[PDB]
C-alpha cells in the first residue's frame, strides 16, 4: 500500500507588526504528526500524534534547528519575491512550501516533491525527475536559472530517495497500529422532500480513515456525477472524516437511485438506497 510523508510550510509577512509568522506542519498520510509555529511561547518542533512522543531530544533539537534555518530562508525569500515582482513595500505577502515523499508497495520512493507558491499561486516546482524545475512565470525563471547552475536539484533527489523515505518508514513503524488501520465508512441515505415535486437524496459516509473516498449516485447502472452536489471531505476531529453526496430526484422515484461507496477499508464497495 502507498504512504506519504508531507510537510506544509507557510510564511506570512506582517509589515509593522513584527517578523513574518512561520508555521510548519508534517503529515504521514492523513495523520498530522509534528508542528513548528514561530508564534509559540518557545518555538520548536513538537509532536502532534501520540506515537511521536517516542522520539528523543536529539530528534527534536535537530528538527527545530532545520525549521529555524528554513524560517530565515523564508524571510529572505519574501523580500526577494517582492523585488522580482517589483511590489510596493508595506504589503503583507505569503510564501508556501510543500515537500515530501510518496512511496509504493515496496515502500520505496514513487514521487518526490519540493515546490513553492507566492501569494497563493505556483512559483516553482521540482519536477518528478527530481532533476529539473518548472518555473510558473518570469520571476520564477530567475530563480530557476540560479538553481539550475548550482546543482540544487541533486541535493533534493538525494534527500527524497534517502532520508525522506527512511524517515517515513520509521514513522510507519512508530505508529503502525494506528497509521495502517482503516475505519471503513458507516454510510446511510437520508431523505428530504424539497417541494411537492422533487426530493433530495443525501448519501452520508462517516467515521472513515484514510480520507480518500469515492461516493457516487447511480440510476439504472449509470453514474449521475453531473447531477451530484458533493461537499468536500471534512475532519470529524477524532482522526476520522465525513462526506456526503446528494441528488434531487422526482418524488416516488427515490427507489430507483443507489449510492456507491469505495474506500480502502471496503474490499467490496457499498451499494445503498433509501
Amino acid at each position: 500500500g502507498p504512504h506519504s510523508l508531507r510537510y506544509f510550510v507557510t510564511a506570512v509577512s506582517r509589515p509593522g507588526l513584527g517578523e513574518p509568522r512561520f508555521i510548519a506542519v508534517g503529515y504521514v498520510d492523513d495523520t498530522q504528526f509534528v508542528r513548528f509555529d514561530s508564534d509559540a511561547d518557545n518555538p520548536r518542533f513538537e509532536p502532534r500524534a501520540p506515537w511521536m512522543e517516542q522520539e528523543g531530544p536529539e530528534y527534536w533539537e535537530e528538527q527545530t534547528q532545520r525549521a529555524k534555518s528554513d524560517e530565515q530562508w523564508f524571510r529572505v525569500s519574501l523580500r526577494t519575491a517582492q523585488r522580482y515582482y517589483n511590489q510596493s513595500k508595506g504589503g503583507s505577502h505569503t510564501f508556501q512550501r510543500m515537500f515530501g515523499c510518496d512511496v509504493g508497495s515496496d515502500w520505496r520512493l514513487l514521487r518526490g516533491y519540493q515546490q513553492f507558491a507566492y501569494d497563493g499561486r505556483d512559483y516553482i516546482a521540482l519536477n518528478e525527475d527530481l532533476k529539473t524545475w518548472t518555473a510558473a512565470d518570469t520571476a520564477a525563471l530567475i530563480t530557476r536559472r540560479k538553481w539550475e547552475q548550482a546543482g540544487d536539484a541533486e541535493y533534493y533527489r538525494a534527500y527524497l530517495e534517502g532520508e525522506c523515505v527512511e524517515w517515513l518508514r520509521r514513522y510507519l513503524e512508530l505508529g503502525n497500529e494506528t497509521l495502517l488501520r482503516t475505519d471503513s465508512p458507516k454510510a446511510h441515505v437520508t431523505y428530504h422532500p424539497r417541494s411537492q415535486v422533487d426530493v433530495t437524496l443525501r448519501c452520508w459516509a462517516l467515521g472513515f480513515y484514510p480520507a480518500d473516498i469515492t461516493l457516487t449516485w447511480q440510476l439504472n447502472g449509470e453514474d449521475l456525477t453531473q447531477d451530484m452536489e458533493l461537499v468536500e471531505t471534512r475532519p470529524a476531529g477524532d482522526g476520522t472524516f465525513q462526506k456526503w453526496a446528494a441528488v434531487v430526484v422526482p418524488l416516488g422515484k427515490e427507489q430507483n437511485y443507489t449510492c456507491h461507496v469505495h474506500h480502502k477499508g471496503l474490499p467490496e464497495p457499498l451499494t445503498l438506497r433509501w
Binding site: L5, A24, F45, Q63, W147, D152, E163
Partner: peptide, 9 residues
C-alpha cells in the same frame, strides 16, 4: 526528516 532549502530564491 524536515529538510532545508539550499539555494536562495
Amino acid at each position: 526528516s524536515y529538510v532545508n532549502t539550499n539555494m536562495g530564491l
